[PDB]
Amino acid sequence: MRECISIHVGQAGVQIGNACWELYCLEHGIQPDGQMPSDSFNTFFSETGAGKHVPRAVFVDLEPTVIDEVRTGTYRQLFHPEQLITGKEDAANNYARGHYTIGKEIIDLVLDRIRKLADQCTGLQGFLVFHSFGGGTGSGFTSLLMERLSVDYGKKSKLEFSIYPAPQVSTAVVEPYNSILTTHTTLEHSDCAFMVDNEAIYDICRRNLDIERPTYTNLNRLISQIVSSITASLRFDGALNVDLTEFQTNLVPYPRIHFPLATYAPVISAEKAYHEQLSVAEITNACFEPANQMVKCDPRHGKYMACCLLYRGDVVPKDVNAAIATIKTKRSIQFVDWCPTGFKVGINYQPPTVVPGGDLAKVQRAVCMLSNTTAIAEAWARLDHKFDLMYAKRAFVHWYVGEGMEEGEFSEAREDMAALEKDYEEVGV
Ligand SMILES: Nc1nc2c(ncn2[C@@H]2O[C@H](COP(=O)(O)OP(=O)(O)OP(=O)(O)O)[C@@H](O)[C@H]2O)c(=O)[nH]1
Ligand SMILES: [Mg+2]
């Protein structure tokens, strides 16, 4: 058994962290008090003499209001007080403030509390980092944390769960700056990053769940399902993606191109009284629909470098192969010339767990497709354009420079993103 430490940074990371661990507890049969009347799950949960199952997680925010909801919440007994770290004042949507100014005053405390968790590990695999691109803390502090983690734990793999900003879901005007700034700094320290576009989850919640104006709870519960499908292989016995290393090996050919696209199916409204259960072929076909992707883009106009299929539920290997073989002769799936046109398949026999009273209906079978497509570069292009619009006038720059950051960092970060777009283009045809 090899352990995994989850790190939740800023409001987005913390709130999503809440949704994930709520789900993890439901899947493993762990009550909020920590007791488990019923190993692979020990990778995410430590055990006390009392039989309490404690999440191997760290919550960090530069202001206390978000984490305070955890300290007083349903799962207040689940986490050790040390795991919940809060500062006085936040980064004010300022990357520089979160990274340089405030980050310096709390980084040592965070690393020390993380060290506590690392000493409880017989063989730490690495870290799972949850954060937003837009927040001053989510962008600024995360990148600093990732840098220090690479120093203190060089040999440990680091995975990211990033929240891509969207105007439909409460963004600030400066969030394109923070997104580029954090991607640049974190790029060399992240082995594999799963971007989650708030616009895509917003639309999935409106389309499939019939929620006119989705809340953070609606969004996070949907995100948690995807995150759970990604980490299920680490928490259950699963011959595929058994360790953090396999994620890079199976999905990341080139170090810089470490942004796999996630696609989930099926998403059924719980209010839908009458619904027939979808077959293995039907949910597999839904993996190739842009509407079911976590990031808004067109894989039809890109090339695949890797593809992995993560099934959960009543899924027989026979039906999976029959579906894959059929899909290849009907769909337009273009792989890169230098890569094997194939699929890595993983099956978890326990069906997806859903939050009681949630918006998501219980299904017999579901699948999460992780595909490294050059089409995800569309998200970088959209983000880089917004950066260019503001940076051309040097709008809002004075705020970052005021925090100790140099003007050069902006251009340095943008040039790195420009190189990243070029890399995706070269890798196509
Ligand atoms: N999906 C999702 N996105 C969130 C959530 N909370 C915040 N966000 C997004 O995060 C971005 C703002 O960053 P925050 O995480 O709130 O800020 P922060 O990381 O706390 O940093 P500060 O600026 O110091 O408060 C916006 O684009 C929000 O849409 C959440 O619970 N779920
Ligand atoms: Mg905040």
Numbering used by the authors: 1 to 38, 47 to 437
Q: Which statements did the authors publish about this structure?
A:
Kinesins are microtubule-associated motor proteins that produce a mechanical work associated with ATP hydrolysis. We report here the crystal structure of a monomeric functional construct of the human kinesin-13 Kif2C, also named MCAK, in complex with tubulin. The Kif2C construct comprised the motor domain and the C-terminal part of the neck region and has been called “short neck+motor” (Kif2C-(sN+M))5. For crystallization purpose, Kif2C-(sN+M) was fused to a designed ankyrin repeat protein (DARPin)20 that binds tubulin and prevents its self-assembly.
We have determined the structure of a functional construct of Kif2C in an ATP-like state and bound to tubulin. In particular, Kif2C binds at the αβ interface of a curved tubulin heterodimer. Our data underscore a major structural rearrangement of the tubulin-binding subdomain of Kif2C, and of the α4-L12-α5 region in particular. The large movement of the α4 and α5 helices upon tubulin binding, with a ~25° rotation to adopt a conformation similar to that in tubulin-bound kinesin-1, led also to the reorganization of the α5/β5a–β5b interaction. The movement and lengthening of α4 led several conserved kinesin-13 residues to point toward tubulin, bringing in particular Arg510 in the vicinity of Glu113 of the tubulin α subunit, Lys524 in that of α-tubulin Glu414 and Glu415, and Glu525 in the vicinity of Arg402 from the same tubulin subunit. Upon tubulin binding, as in the case of motile kinesins, the Kif2C L11 loop became fully ordered. In agreement with previous studies, in the tubulin–Kif2C–DARPin structure, the Kif2C KVD motif at the tip of the L2 hairpin interacts with the distal end of the tubulin α subunit, corresponding to the inter-tubulin longitudinal interface of a protofilament. The contribution of the L2 loop leads Kif2C to bury a larger surface with the α subunit (about 1000 Å2) than with β-tubulin (about 720 Å2), different from kinesin-1 in which the buried surface is more evenly distributed between the two tubulin subunits. In the crystal structure, the neck helix pointed toward the solvent and interacted neither with the Kif2C motor domain nor with tubulin. Whereas the neck helix orientation we found has not been observed previously in structures of isolated kinesin-13s, this orientation likely results from a helix swapping mechanism stabilized in the crystal.
